[PDB]
Amino acid sequence: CEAIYAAPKCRRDSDCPGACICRGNGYCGEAIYAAPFAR
Asked: What is the domain range of residue 35?
């Protein structure tokens, strides 16, 4: 769920869509970008 323009911000990993985690940028994104699961 990584996006640059329309990036969903995170508070906690759980508030990230799909299975995304709260990345160190402050936004939600998948754990492994190479892994197609829930980006």
From this structure: 1-39
Q: Find tokens 């640059």 and name the residue.
A: 4
DSSP-based three-state secondary structure for 8: coil
Question: How many Cα atoms sit within 13 Å of 20 on the Cβ side?
Answer: 21
Number of domains composing the chain: 1
Q: How far apart are CA 26 and CA 36, in angstroms?
A: 21
Experimental method, per PDB record: NMR
Please work out, in degrees rounded to the nearest 5, the angle formed at the alpha carbon of residue 14 by the alpha carbons of 11 and 20.
Answer: 95
Determine the Cα–Cα distance for residues 29 and 23; give it in Å rounded to an integer. Answer: 6
Handedness of CA 17, 10, 13, 29 (dihedral sign): positive
